Copies of this chain bind each other. A is one copy, B any other.
Amino acid sequence: PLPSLAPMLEKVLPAVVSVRVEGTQPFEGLGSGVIINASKGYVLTNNHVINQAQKISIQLNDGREFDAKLIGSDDQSDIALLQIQNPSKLTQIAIADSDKLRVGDFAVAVGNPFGLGQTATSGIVSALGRSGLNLEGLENFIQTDASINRGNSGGALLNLNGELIGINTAILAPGGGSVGIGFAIPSNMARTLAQQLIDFGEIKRGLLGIKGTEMSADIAKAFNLDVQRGAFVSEVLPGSGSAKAGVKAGDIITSLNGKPLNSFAELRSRIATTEPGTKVKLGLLRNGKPLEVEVTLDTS
């Protein structure tokens, strides 16, 4: 009868694992992970967690320990995929559409802070599409005020249905501890990158064939436009998908697949996460007139 997160945490907590690492001088590292495929034993984590690893072990919240092998990783986005050796009676997580997230939505962080064991912390979605934090090469972070500390890395950011909305990755902390400014790689980005690693053992980096800057209020005022966020195209590379689709220098990319862009940095991370050959719909503004253009991504 009393409101609680316990009925949904009960079912979902076994999917979030502790990731123990050993490697090169000898060292012992600790982070978290999320079981994305119970049958194959596929675990999502951060690349900075398994980076110098020679031996990787996974621990379930029931005490069961398993060995794990690195399937693949991406240095730029900070996502690594592991495979549990001889998986058995595993629980997997359901993945939500992180593009349907909004500031104010409730979030639960599940990880292993300070190697204490499985810890759940609660908060809200503080911000979305966060970039220019110079944490990662590719950033499109969910920001949350759920307490996220060292050892929370690779862990789950969940909604109130216990579905994955993101992979806890970094924090802003003056003194090494949580102040309520935490960052998660969104679920759609982690899911897509995970698929590339299950299919090829490596990521396939997509590119538009565009060169540009951040759209500003200053460009918008100069051309009497009602949008001030997005990508300002300065150059369209010849022979690229963008040239073939009819993208022109001076265009303002406003949307990607119908969803508005809050920055060029968001566009850059969303396109590099997408596989070459994939077709995307670009929302454009040419001399103050709207256009929709379908672009086939090239390889980087």
Where the two chains meet, the residues of A that have a C-beta atom closer than 8 Å to any C-beta of B are 2-10, 13, 59, 62-65, 102-106, 108, 113-114, 116-127, 130, 133, 143, 145-147, 149, 159-161, 172-181, 215-218, 220, 227-229
Given contacts A127-B118, A145-B147, contact A2 B160 (CB under 8 A): yes
Q: Looking at A59, A133, A217, A229, which has the most chain B CB atoms within 10 Å of its CB?
A: A217
Measured CB to CB, the nearest residue on chain B to A147 is: B180
From residue A114, how far is it (CB to closest CB) to chain B in Å? Answer: 6
Measured CB to CB, the nearest residue on chain B to A121 is: B145
**10 A-B residue pairings within 8 Å (CB atoms):** A6-B125, A10-B103, A59-B217, A63-B228, A116-B181, A117-B127, A118-B127, A119-B127, A120-B124, A122-B123
Q: Are B118 and A121 in touch, CB under 8 angstroms?
A: no
Q: Are A160 and B3 in touch, CB under 8 angstroms?
A: yes
From residue A82, how far is it (CB to closest CB) to chain B in Å? Answer: 18
A102, B10: Cα distance in complex, Å: 8
Chain B residues positioned under 8 Å from A181 (CB to CB): 113-114, 116, 119, 147, 149
Please give me the 4 A-B residue pairs with the lowest Cβ-Cβ distance, nearest first: A147-B180, A5-B104, A63-B228, A177-B179
Q: Are A65 and B217 in touch, CB under 8 angstroms?
A: yes
Measured CB to CB, the nearest residue on chain B to A228 is: B63
From residue A161, how far is it (CB to closest CB) to chain B in Å? Answer: 7
Given contacts A126-B119, A143-B116, A228-B64, contact A161 B2 (CB under 8 A): yes
